[PDB]
Design a binder for this molecule. Structure first.
Ligand SMILES: [Cl-]
Ligand SMILES: [Cl-]
Ligand SMILES: [Mg+2]
Ligand SMILES: [Mg+2]
Ligand SMILES: [Mg+2]
Ligand SMILES: [Mg+2]
Ligand SMILES: [Mg+2]
Lengths: 222, 195, 204, 4, 222, 233, 125, 212, 196, 195, 196, 4, 4, 4
C-alpha cells in the first residue's frame, strides 16, 4: 500500500532573547538508515524579519514554507506593503496547517523573529496548527533530548537559590546572544552524540532589528 | 440516553424517560429531559447515539411547528408518526444515518383517543398499548403483559409505571438516575414533578 | 499493552571522582492514574546497588531474586559480591529468560572494594550489558535523561557536585515525562559511606 | 496532534 | 552495526564499529563487538546485542571444554559447526549475525553465519546495517595477496564507510589480527575518529542548587 | 495507489570541478525476470540537462513525454528559446518536483526516483533528487536504490564536501562512477552489465555515452572457494 | 438558467421594474396598521365586486408568520404567498439555531432582504 | 487535560490546567485552555489542541458578527449552539473536543453549556471535562455548596484542578482561574503547581500520601 | 538459484550458479551450491541456504555411518535419506535438492527432490528459480549418452540462459564431474558464458 | 465485582466492597460479600474476572489457614501480602492467569499497627494509607488526597468512606448496590451492618 | 496463455495458442487470441479475456476513425492507442498485449505492452504465462531477417514448448502472417506440433 | 474469470 | 534469509 | 532490546 508520508529526520531549535531571536537546525537529511545530504538547509528567511522551519517530512515542510512565503508576498500586495507582524504570521500559519486537518503536513513548525515592541519571539506549532508563543522550543527527532535541557538552562527549571532551603527559585532573566549560541551549539552536539538522525552540520539564523544573520558550524558526521 | 417507556391507557399516553447522561465513567447529568413537544397534543421521547438524538428531535419539532403555522391546524398523531417514520426510513440509507429511536405519544382530538407509536432508527413503526426502546423492554414488556389492562385510568397507568421503574432499578446494571414522566391527553401535555 | 510503560518510572547513574551516584523517581502508576508516591526503584546487596525500571511486578520480583542469589553467594564465597561480578549475574539471569523476559531496565552502580574503582552498568530486558565511564539511563523518560546527561555531565565531579548534576538530570527529564516523577531519591556512594537524599520536585 |  | 573480515598472506583480520542503537537512540557509543571464542578464534557480531554475546560465550565455553578433552588447540570449523547448529535449532529467533575468524593447526579461516544458521566462506566479508557501505569498499579495493598492513587498512576503511554513511554505525573502529604462528592481537579502539569536541560551557551547578527534603546514612555493612 | 511493474534500478551521479556526471544501466526488470535490455533511463533535455530515472518504466515513459512537451511549449512565442530563455536544469527540476508532489498528494504517485543533472547558464553545476513522495535534496553525490547504499559511500570518498568539487577532475569522477557501476553489478540482483553515462560540462557541453559495459571484473578467487565450511574437495 | 437582467437602471437613474411593482401595490386592496400603547392592529379592505365568495376557505389577508408575529400586504396575492412561506421557514430556523423566536425587526429585515435580492438577480422580476 | 466550571451564588467559576501531551511526552506546560470570546463569554478547551483552539477562536468571530448584525451581545445558548451545530456537521470525521461555554447575559443569567465533538450539548451547573475530570469531580462534588463565598468558590475550583493535576498523569503545569459575574469575567491568575502543591499541602495539611 | 544435473556416457555432471540472495542484495556472489555427501554422491542445493546446508550435513553424517557398517551406499540410498528428511519435515523446510552420483554398476544417476519431498529419478534434472526460463531450451537440446564435452556445453549454455533472465541467479557457473576416473571441479566465469 | 476500597486510619484498616453481582443486563445479586478472612487479624477483598476472584481468594485462605495450624501462629500482614503477591506474580505468566485484584487489610499485633496492601493481578504490591481497584480510584484517590489525615479515628475513617461512596453513587455509571464495610483492628475483624 | 510476434524479411508473424481458462477448467480450447485492429495491424492478447477484448474493440474503433480522417495509421500509432488505454487504466486492467503490423515504409514492426502499460519496440516479443518457459529457447534461436518458412518454424517450435510445459496453454497454434502480399491465417494441430 |  |  |  502506498504510504504518502516519510521521515527525513533532523532536529530544530528556537530561542528568544530580549531584542533578538534564533532559529537553529541541523543540515542533515535522511531516510531510514541512509544519509541523503549532509547540507540541506531547513531554516529559512521568509521576509519581514521572520525565520521559519518546518521539520519532519521534508516534502511537507517545503510545501508549507513555500505557501507561507507566498502568503507574505500577497499580504504586501493586498494591504499596501504593510509589515507582517510575527503574531499575524503565526495565526496565518495556523490556518495553513489546519486547512489540511484531514490530510496533515507531517511537520513540527517553529518561527522566530521580533514582536511589535521589538522583543524576541518564538512560536511553535503542532502538525495541524495548534500554536503558542514561548521563550524556548526544540522540535523534530531529537526534541525529547534537547527540550528538557532548555527547560533547565533557558527557563531555570528545578534550579533554586543556594542556601534558601529550596524556597527561592533561580530568578528568570534574558540571555545574551553569546550565551544563547552556546546553548544551541551544546544542545546540538549532545543531540548528535545520542541521536543517529542528527549530525553533519548546524545552521543558525539570528534575527535582530537590523535583519537576519547566519552562522554555521560543523557537527559529527557518523 | 438508554431508558424510554410509554404506556397508553383509556384517556392518555404516559411517557417515562431516564434522566442520566453518561459519557465514559462519568454521569455528566441527572436531570436530562429526553423529550420534545411536537405539537400541543403530541410528544416525542428519544434515545440513541449521542448528538444524533437531540438534532433529530429538534429537526422534527421544527418541521411539525412549521406545518402548524402554515395550515393553522394540528396534525394528527398518526400523521406525525408517519412523517417521522419516513424521515427515519430515508435516513437509514443515507451516508450517515440518524441512530435514534423514538416513542411518539399523542392525543388525537378528532377521534378522542390516545395513541402511542414506537419507531426505531430503521423506520420500523408500530402502534402499541405500551412500548419501550433498548434493554428496558426486556423487563417491562413481560411485566406489562401481566399487569396492564386496556381501560386503566391515568392514575392506574402511573402506578403501573412505578412497577416498571422499580423493576428496572432492581435488575438493570446502570444507574439511570430516575425518570421524568409526562402525560398527553385531551388537555395537552403536562409533567409529573415528583416521581 | 506495552509492559515497559504501564507503571512508569526512571533510573539514572553517574560516575565521579572516587564516587558513584544512582537516582530514581518514586512514581508507580497504572497508565494515567498515579497510585503510589513511595515506590523506590533502587536496592542494594551489600555495597552493590541495583536500580530497576519497567514493569513494577518484575522490578519487585527481580529484587527478591537477586537478594536470594547474593545471600547464597555470600554464604558460599565468604565475601560480599562485587559490582563487576553482580553485573554478570544480572546478565545471566535475564538472558536465562530470553523468550519470556522480565520487562525491566536494570542499572548497577557501586565501588569495587578491592580496587576502589567506581563502576556503573546498564542492561536491556534480555541481559545485554552496557558498561560506561560516564552515565547510564533507564525508564520511560530515557530520551530526556540521555539529553540531560549528555549536556550536563562532565568527568571527575566531586560527590557534592555530582549530586547536583545527577539530580538536575533526573528532575528535568522527569518533568517532560507524564509517567515519571512524583518524588525522587539520590544515592551518593563513596568507598565506605553512602548518603541517601530525597529531592523536592513538582508533584504533577 | 497533541491533546489537552 | 558494521563488521568485516579480511583474509591476508598469513592469517585473517576482523573489524567492527562500536555503536549500539535502541531505535534512533545511541545506547552505547563504545561497545565491543569483537568476541574471543578461544585465544586464536575471534568473532564479530551484529544483530540482537545480547544474542551475539550469549551465543559467543556459550560456544566459547564448550570449545574450551572440548580443547581440554581432546588435548588439541580449537579449530574455527568447530566453532562454526557448533554456532550454526545452535542457531539453526532456534529457527532465526536468536538474532546473531557473525563473522567468525581465526587460526588453528589447519591454517587460517574466515566465515560468516546468519541467524537462521547458514554459513559462508570468503576472503572478504561484511555483515550488519553498514554491510553495503563496507562491501562497496571491499569490492573496490580488495585483492588477492594482501599483506597484514594492507588487510588492516582495508578492513578499517570498510568499517569507516559504515561509520560515515550508515546511521546504524558510528564512533570507533575495533580490530583483531590473527596471524599464523603468533598470538592474536586485539586492537581495541584502533581508530577513534569521532572524538566529541570541547563543550562551549561547563554546566557544573552552584552547590545547594537542588532542593533536598531528607538525608540519611545508608548501612552497607554487617 | 499503485505498484511498480517494469522497473529500473539505481541511478548514480556526482559533481566534479566543471560539471556533473550521471549514469544508469539499460535494464527494465519485471520482478526477478530481467525482461528488457535496451532501456534508456537517462533522458537529455536540451544540451544542458540530463534526467536519470529509476522505478516504474511506464511512469518514466510518461515523464519523457512531459519533458519533450515542455521543450515544445518553451519554444512557443519565444525568440530566445535557444539562448537566454532556454530551459535551465533548475526549471526542469522544479517542474518535475511540482508534479511528483502533486501526484503523491492525490494518492496516485509516479513510482519513480529522479535525479536531474546539468549545468546552469552561469556555469554552476546542478544536481538534485526528487522521488514519488516529492522529497527533494541536493548533495555533491546522489544515487537511487542500491546506488544510495553502495555508490554514495564510494563517490563520497572522492567528493566528501563542497570544497572537494574544485579538486575533482572529470577523469577522476568518471572513474569513480564507472567503478561504482561495477560494484552494483556484483551486488545488485536487478542490475545489468550494460549502461549509459552522461557528462554535462560547462565548457564541452553534453557528452552522452551509450552501450558502456562493466569491465575488469574480479572473479578468479571463486575457484578457491569449496563447500560452505568443512568440505575440502 | 434564464439569466436576463430585468431590473436595470434607466438614464434618469430609475429602476422601472421596481417602480412598476409599486404600481401593482397601488392597485392592491388597502391595508392599514396602527399600533396602540400595548397592541398593534392590522386592518384590511376586501374589494366588494365579489359575492358568492366562500369566506371559510378563502385565503385571509393577515398571515401568522410565527405565533407572535403577523404579516399583511397590498399587491399581487400570489407573490405574497412566496414571501410568507420563506418568512415562516426562517422563523422556525431562527428558533432552531438561536433558541429564541424572531424579533419583529429581524423578520422584517429578512423579508426585506428577500425583496431586495429579487431587484438585482437575473431572470426574476 | 482537566477543566471545570461551576455555577454558584456569586456567578460562575472556571478553572483549567495547562498541560498538553503527545502520548507520555509532555509537549507543553503553558497552554491557555480558556479562550476569552468576549467580556461576558468564556470557552474551555479539552481534547485535540488544534481542534479546540481553531474552532473556539472561529466561534469568537461568529459571536462578533452576531452583535454587528443584531446590535446585541450573543446569548450563551446561541453561542454554544453555533459550536455544537458546527462540530455536528463534522461528526465521524474525527474531531476531538470537550468544551464548556461559560457566560452571563441579562436574559439568561450566569449559564454554562457543555459541548463535545459527538454533538452533545447540555446546560448545567457543574461540569468537569478531560482525562482528569473524575479527580476534579471527587474534590469538587464533596465540597460544593450553592452558597460558597466568591473566595471559597475560587479556592475550590483551584483546589479541584490541583487534585487532578496531582493524580492524573496527563494534567499539570499550572491552574488558570476565572470568575464570571453580571459585569463580565475577571481573571484570577496563573498558578504553577510547582509551588501551589507545596503551599496547599503545608497550609491545608492534605496530601499525606506524599513524602513531605 | 539455478541448478541442474545431467547423466551422460561416462557418468553424471552437476552444475550451478554461485549467487546467494538476501532480498535483491547479493549476499554471496561466489557460493558453492554443489555439495559432497559421499566420495561420488553429490547434490545441488536450492531454496533456503540454512535448510539445505543443515540437510546436507545430516545426510553426509548418515552416509558416513552407513559406509562404516555396510560399505559404499548407492545413489538411490543417498536420495532416500534426503527424501526422508525433506518429506518428514516438509512444513518447516524450503529445500529443492537434486541428488547425483556415480556407481560402477549403475553408472550416472540423477534424483530430484522438489519442495514436498517427493522423489523423481530422471536422465537430467533442472531446478531453482532460474530453471523456469530453460525448460524450453533444455527439453529441446538434451539427448542421452552425450560425451563429457557435449554435457559440459549443454550445462554451460543452459545455466547461461537461466542466469541471463533470472535476477536471482548469477556469478560463476560451477560444475562437478562424476565418473569412474574420479571427481573433477569445473568453473566458468561471466566473460566466457555471458556472450555464448 | 467492580468497587473495592480500603482506608488505613490510626488504629484500624477499613475495607468497603460493593454488593452487586451483574451478568449481562441483570443484577443477579445485591448482597455479595467480596471478601475472605485469611487469619483472625487479616482480611482480603477482591475484584476481577468472574469465577477467578472467589477461586483465588479461597485458595489463599486455605493456604494461610494451613500455615496457622502447622505453626500455631498468625502470619503478619506483611508476610501474607508477600505470599499473595508471589502467587499472583507466578500466575501472570501461567497458561491462564488469575485476573483478580485484591486489597489486604490487616492489624499487625507485633507492631500494633494497621496495614493496607494494594495488589493487582500482575502481582504489583504497594502499601498505602488508602487504596482502590478499578474505576473507583479515579474519584476516591483525589477525594482522599484532600480529606484524609494520618491520625484519624475509626469513626472519622467511616465518615471519610461515606464521602467516597456518596461520590461514587453520584458519578459512577453503574448501580453497584452499596457496600459492605469491615473493620480490622487489634481485636480482629468485624462488619458494620448499616451502611 | 502463450503468445508471440516475430519480425522477418518480408514483414511480421503473430502466433498464439488457443486456450481460455476458467481456473483449471478449459473454458475454450479453440480461442482466437490474434485480433485485427486494422487491415495490417493486429495484436496478440493475454491476461483477462474481457479486458483485452474491450481494449481491442476500442482500439479498432479509434483506428477506423483515424483512417476516415487521416488515412492509414502507422503500427507505432496503433501501439500508442493501446498504451494510452493500458497505462491510464493500469489499476483496473489485466492485459498483456503484443501489437504487430506491416507498413510498406517500415516493413514489419512489433511493440509489446506488458501489465503497467509501458511500450517496448522489439525484433520479436513473447508473452503470456507460457512464455517464461521459452525465454531460453527463443533467445538462442531467433535471428533477424529470417524467411517466412523459418519464422513459421521458430514460432511453431517455441509455442510447442510453451504449450508442453505450461498447463495454461494448449489446443491449436494459430498464426497470422503480415506482408505486402496481404494477410494469411495459419493453424497447426496437436498431432503435428506436439512431437516436434 | 476467463484468462488467456 | 539467504536463499539460493 | 538493543541492536548492533
Ligand atoms: Cl549456501
Ligand atoms: Cl478471448
Ligand atoms: Mg548522530
Ligand atoms: Mg512528570
Ligand atoms: Mg499530572
Ligand atoms: Mg528451517
Ligand atoms: Mg542474473
Amino acid at each position: 500500500q502506498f504510504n504518502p508520508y516519510g521521515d527525513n529526520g533532523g532536529t530544530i531549535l528556537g530561542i528568544a532573547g530580549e531584542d533578538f531571536a534564533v532559529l537553529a537546525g541541523d543540515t542533515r537529511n535522511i531516510t531510514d538508515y541512509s544519509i541523503n545530504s549532509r547540507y540541506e538547509p531547513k531554516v529559512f528567511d521568509c521576509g519581514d524579519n521572520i525565520v521559519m522551519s518546518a521539520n519532519g517530512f521534508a516534502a511537507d515542510g517545503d510545501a508549507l514554507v513555500k505557501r507561507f512565503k507566498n502568503s507574505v508576498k500577497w499580504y504586501h500586495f493586498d494591504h499596501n506593503d504593510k509589515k507582517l507582524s510575527i503574531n499575524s504570521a503565526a495565526r496565518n500559519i495556523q490556518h495553513l496547517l489546519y486547512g489540511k486537518r484531514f490530510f496533515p503536513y507531517y511537520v513540527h513548525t517553529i518561527i522566530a523573529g521580533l514582536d511589535e515592541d521589538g522583543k524576541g519571539a518564538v512560536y511553535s506549532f503542532d502538525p495541524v496548527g495548534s500554536y503558542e508563543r514561548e521563550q524556548c522550543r526544540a522540535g523534530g527527532a531529537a526534541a525529547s533530548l534537547i527540550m528538557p535541557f532548555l527547560d533547565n538552562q533557558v527557563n531555570f527549571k528545578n534550579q533554586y537559590e543556594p542556601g534558601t532551603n529550596g524556597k527561592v527559585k533561580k530568578p528568570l532573566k534574558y540571555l545574551s546572544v553569546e550565551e544563547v549560541i552556546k546553548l544551541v551549539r551544546d544542545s546540538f552536539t549532545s543531540a548528535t552524540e545520542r541521536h543517529i538522525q542528527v549530525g553533519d552540520g548546524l545552521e543558525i539564523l539570528i534575527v535582530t532589528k537590523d535583519g537576519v544573520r547566519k552562522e554555521f558550524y560543523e557537527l559529527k558526521r557518523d | 440516553m438508554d431508558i424510554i417507556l410509554g404506556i397508553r391507557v383509556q384517556d392518555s399516553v404516559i411517557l417515562a424517560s431516564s434522566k442520566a447522561v453518561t459519557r465514559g465513567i462519568s454521569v455528566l447529568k441527572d436531570s436530562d429531559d429526553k423529550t420534545r413537544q411536537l405539537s400541543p397534543h403530541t410528544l416525542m421521547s428519544f434515545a440513541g447515539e449521542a448528538g444524533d438524538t437531540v438534532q433529530f428531535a429538534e429537526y422534527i419539532q421544527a418541521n411539525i411547528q412549521l406545518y402548524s403555522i402554515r395550515e393553522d391546524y394540528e396534525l394528527s398523531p398518526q400523521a406525525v408518526s408517519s412523517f417521522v417514520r419516513q424521515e427515519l426510513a430515508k435516513s437509514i440509507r443515507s451516508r450517515r444515518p440518524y441512530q435514534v429511536n423514538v416513542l411518539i405519544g399523542g392525543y388525537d382530538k378528532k377521534k378522542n383517543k390516545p395513541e402511542l407509536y414506537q419507531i426505531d432508527y430503521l423506520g420500523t413503526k408500530v402502534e402499541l398499548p405500551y412500548g419501550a426502546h433498548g434493554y428496558s423492554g426486556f423487563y417491562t414488556f413481560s411485566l406489562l403483559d401481566h399487569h396492564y389492562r386496556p381501560d386503566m385510568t391515568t392514575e392506574e397507568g402511573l402506578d403501573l409505571l412505578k412497577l416498571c421503574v422499580q423493576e428496572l432499578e432492581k435488575r438493570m446494571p446502570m444507574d439511570f438516575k430516575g425518570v421524568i414522566v409526562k402525560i398527553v391527553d385531551k388537555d395537552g401535555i403536562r409533567q409529573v414533578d415528583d416521581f | 499493552s506495552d509492559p515497559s510503560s504501564i507503571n512508569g518510572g526512571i533510573v539514572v547513574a553517574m560516575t565521579g571522582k572516587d564516587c558513584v551516584a544512582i537516582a530514581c523517581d518514586l512514581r508507580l502508576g497504572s497508565q494515567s492514574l498515579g497510585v503510589s508516591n513511595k515506590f523506590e526503584k533502587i536496592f542494594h546487596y551489600g555495597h552493590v546497588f541495583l536500580g530497576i525500571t519497567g514493569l513494577a511486578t518484575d522490578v519487585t520480583t527481580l529484587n527478591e531474586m537477586f537478594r536470594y542469589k547474593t545471600n547464597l553467594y555470600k554464604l558460599k564465597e565468604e565475601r560480599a559480591i562485587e559490582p563487576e561480578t553482580f553485573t554478570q549475574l544480572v546478565s545471566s539471569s535475564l538472558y536465562e529468560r530470553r523468550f519470556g523476559p522480565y520487562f525491566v531496565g536494570p542499572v548497577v552502580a557501586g565501588i569495587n572494594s578491592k580496587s576502589g574503582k567506581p563502576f556503573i552498568a546498564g542492561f536491556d530486558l534480555i541481559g545485554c550489558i552496557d558498561e560506561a565511564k560516564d552515565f547510564i539511563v533507564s525508564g520511560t523518560a530515557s530520551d530526556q535523561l540521555f539529553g540531560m546527561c549528555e549536556s550536563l555531565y562532565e568527568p571527575n565531579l566531586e560527590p557534592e557536585d555530582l549530586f547536583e548534576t545527577i539530580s538536575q538530570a533526573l528532575l528535568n527529564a522527569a518533568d517532560r515525562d507524564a509517567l515519571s516523577g512524583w518524588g525522587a531519591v539520590v544515592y551518593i556512594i563513596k568507598k565506605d559511606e553512602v548518603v541517601k537524599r530525597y529531592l523536592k520536585m513538582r508533584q504533577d | 496532534a497533541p491533546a489537552x | 552495526t558494521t563488521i568485516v573480515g579480511v583474509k591476508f598472506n598469513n592469517g585473517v583480520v576482523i573489524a567492527a564499529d562500536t555503536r549500539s542503537t535502541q531505535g534512533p537512540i545511541v545506547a552505547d557509543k563504545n561497545c565491543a563487538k569483537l568476541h574471543r571464542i578461544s585465544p586464536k578464534i575471534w568473532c564479530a557480531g551484529a544483530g540482537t546485542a545480547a544474542d551475539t554475546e550469549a551465543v559467543t560465550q556459550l560456544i566459547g565455553s564448550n570449545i574450551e571444554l572440548h580443547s581440554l578433552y581432546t588435548s588439541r588447540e580449537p579449530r574455527v570449523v568447530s566453532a562454526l559447526q557448533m554456532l550454526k547448529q545452535h542457531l539453526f535449532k532456534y529457527q532465526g529467533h536468536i538474532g546473531a549475525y557473525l563473522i567468525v575468524a581465526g587460526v588453528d593447526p589447519t591454517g587460517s579461516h574466515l566465515f560468516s553465519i546468519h541467524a537462521h544458521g547458514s554459513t559462508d566462506v570468503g576472503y572478504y566479508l561484511s555483515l550488519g546495517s553498514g554491510s553495503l557501505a563496507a562491501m562497496a569498499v571491499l569490492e573496490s579495493h580488495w585483492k588477492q595477496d594482501l599483506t597484514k598492513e594492507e588487510a588492516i587498512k582495508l578492513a578499517s576503511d570498510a568499517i569507516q564507510a559504515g561509520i560515515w554513511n550508515d546511521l546504524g554505525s558510528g564512533s570507533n573502529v575495533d580490530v583483531c589480527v590473527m596471524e599464523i604462528g603468533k598470538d592474536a592481537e586485539y586492537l581495541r579502539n584502533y581508530l577513534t575518529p569521532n572524538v566529541r569536541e570541547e563543550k562551549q560551557k561547563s554546566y557544573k551547578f552552584p552547590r545547594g542548587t537542588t532542593a533536598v527534603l531528607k538525608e540519611s546514612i545508608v548501612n552497607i555493612c554487617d | 495507489t499503485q505498484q511498480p511493474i517494469v522497473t529500473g534500478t539505481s541511478v548514480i551521479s556526482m559533481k566534479y570541478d566543471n560539471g556533473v556526471i550521471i549514469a544508469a544501466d539499460n535494464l527494465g526488470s519485471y520482478g526477478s525476470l530481467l525482461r528488457f535490455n535496451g532501456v534508456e533511463r537517462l533522458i537529455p533535455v536540451g544540451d544542458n540537462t540530463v534526467v536519470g530515472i529509476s522505478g516504474d518504466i511506464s511512469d518514466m515513459q510518461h515523464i519523457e513525454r512531459l519533458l519533450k512537451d515542455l521543450v515544445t511549449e518553451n519554444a512557443y512565442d519565444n525568440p530566445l528559446a535557444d539562448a537566454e530563455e532556454a530551459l535551465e536544469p533548475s526549471y526542469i527540476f522544479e517542474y518535475l518536483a511540482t508534479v511528483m508532489y502533486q501526484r503523491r498528494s492525490k494518492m496516485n504517485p509516479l513510482w519513480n526516483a529522479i535525479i536531474v543533472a546539468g549545468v546552469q547558464s552561469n556555469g554552476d553545476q546542478f544536481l538534485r533528487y526528487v522521488n514519488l513522495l516529492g522529497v527533494t535534496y541536493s548533495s555533491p553525490t546522489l544515487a537511487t536504490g542500491f546506488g544510495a547504499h553502495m555508490a554514495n559511500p564510494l563517490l563520497r570518498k572522492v567528493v566528501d564536501r563542497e570544497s572537494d568539487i574544485p579538486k575533482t577532475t572529470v577523469q577522476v569522477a568518471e572513474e569513480a562512477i564507472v567503478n561504482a557501476m561495477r560494484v552494483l553489478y556484483y551486488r545488485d540482483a536487478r542490475s545489468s552489465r550494460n549502461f549509459s553515462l552522461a557528462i554535462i560540462d560547462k565548457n564541452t557541453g553534453l557528452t552522452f555515452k551509450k552501450n558502456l559495459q562493466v569491465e575488469n571484473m574480479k572473479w578468479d578467487f571463486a575457484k578457491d572457494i569449496k563447500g560452505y565450511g568443512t568440505q575440502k574437495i | 438558467g434564464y439569466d436576463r437582467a430585468l431590473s436595470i437602471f434607466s438614464p434618469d437613474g430609475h429602476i422601472f421594474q421596481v417602480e412598476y411593482a409599486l404600481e401593482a401595490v397601488k392597485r392592491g386592496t388597502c391595508a392599514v396598521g396602527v399600533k396602540g400603547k400595548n397592541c398593534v392592529v392590522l386592518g384590511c379592505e376586501r374589494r366588494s365586486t365579489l359575492k358568492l365568495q366562500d369566506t371559510r376557505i378563502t385565503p385571509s389577508k393577515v398571515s401568522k408568520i410565527d405565533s407572535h408575529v403577523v404579516l399583511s400586504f397590498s399587491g399581487l396575492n400570489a407573490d405574497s404567498r412566496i414571501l410568507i412561506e420563506k418568512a415562516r421557514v426562517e422563523a422556525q430556523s431562527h428558533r432552531l439555531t438561536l433558541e429564541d423566536p424572531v424579533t419583529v425587526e429581524y423578520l422584517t429585515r429578512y423579508v426585506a432582504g428577500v425583496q431586495q435580492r429579487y431587484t438585482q438577480s437575473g431572470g426574476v422580476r | 487535560t482537566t477543566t471545570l466550571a461551576f455555577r454558584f451564588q456569586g456567578g460562575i467559576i472556571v478553572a483549567v490546567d495547562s498541560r498538553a501531551t503527545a502520548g507520555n511526552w509532555v509537549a507543553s506546560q503553558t497552554v491557555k485552555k480558556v479562550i476569552e470570546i468576549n467580556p461576558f463569554l468564556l470557552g474551555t478547551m479539552a481534547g485535540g489542541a488544534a481542534d479546540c483552539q481553531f474552532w473556539e477562536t472561529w466561534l469568537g468571530s461568529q459571536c462578533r458578527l452576531h452583535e454587528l448584525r443584531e446590535k446585541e451581545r450573543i446569548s450563551v445558548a446561541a453561542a454554544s449552539k453555533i459550536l455544537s451545530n458546527l462540530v455536528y456537521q463534522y461528526k465521524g470525521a474525527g474531531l476531538s473536543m470537550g468544551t464548556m461555554i461559560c457566560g452571563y447575559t441579562r436574559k439568561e443569567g450566569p449559564t454554562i453549556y457543555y459541548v463535545d465533538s459527538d454533538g452533545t450539548r447540555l446546560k448545567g451547573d457543574i461540569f468537569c471535562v478531560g482525562s482528569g475530570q473524575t479527580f476534579a469531580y471527587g474534590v469538587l462534588d464533596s465540597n460544593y455548596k450553592w452558597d460558597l463565598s466568591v473566595e471559597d468558590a475560587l479556592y475550590l475550583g483551584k483546589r479541584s484542578i490541583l487534585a487532578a493535576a496531582h493524580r492524573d498523569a496527563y494534567s499539570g503545569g499550572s491552574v488558570n482561574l476565572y470568575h464570571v459575574t453580571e459585569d463580565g469575567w475577571i481573571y484570577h491568575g496563573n498558578h504553577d503547581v510547582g509551588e501551589l502543591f507545596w503551599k496547599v499541602k503545608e497550609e491545608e495539611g492534605s496530601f499525606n500520601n506524599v513524602i513531605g | 538459484t539455478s541448478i541442474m544435473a545431467v547423466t551422460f556416457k561416462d557418468g553424471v555432471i552437476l552444475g550451478a550458479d554461485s549467487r546467494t540472495t538476501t532480498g535483491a542484495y547479493i549476499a554471496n556472489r561466489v557460493t558453492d551450491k554443489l555439495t559432497r555427501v559421499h566420495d561420488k554422491i553429490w547434490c545441488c542445493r536450492s531454496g533456503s541456504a540454512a535448510d539445505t546446508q543443515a540437510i546436507a550435513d545430516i545426510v553426509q553424517y548418515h552416509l558416513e555411518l552407513y559406509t562404516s557398517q555396510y560399505g559404499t551406499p548407492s545413489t538411490e540410498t543417498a536420495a532416500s535419506v534426503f527424501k526422508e528428511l525433506c518429506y518428514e519435515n516438509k512444513d518447516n523446510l524450503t529445500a529443492g535438492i537434486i541428488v547425483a552420483g556415480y556407481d560402477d554398476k549403475n553408472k550416472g544417476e540423477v534424483y530430484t527432490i522438489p519442495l514436498g519431498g517427493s522423489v523423481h529419478k530422471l536422465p537430467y534434472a533442472i531446478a531453482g528459480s532460474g530453471s523456469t526460463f530453460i525448460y524450453g531450451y533444455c527439453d529441446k537440446n538434451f539427448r542421452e549418452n552425450m560425451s563429457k564435452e557435449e554435457t559440459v556445453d549443454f550445462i554451460k549454455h543452459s545455466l547461461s540462459q537461466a542466469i541471463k533472465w533470472d535476477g536471482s541467479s548469477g556469478g560463476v557457473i560451477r560444475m562437478v564431474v562424476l565418473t569412474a576416473a574420479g571427481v573433477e571441479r569445473l568453473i566458468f566465469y561471466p566473460d566466457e558464458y555471458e556472450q555464448l
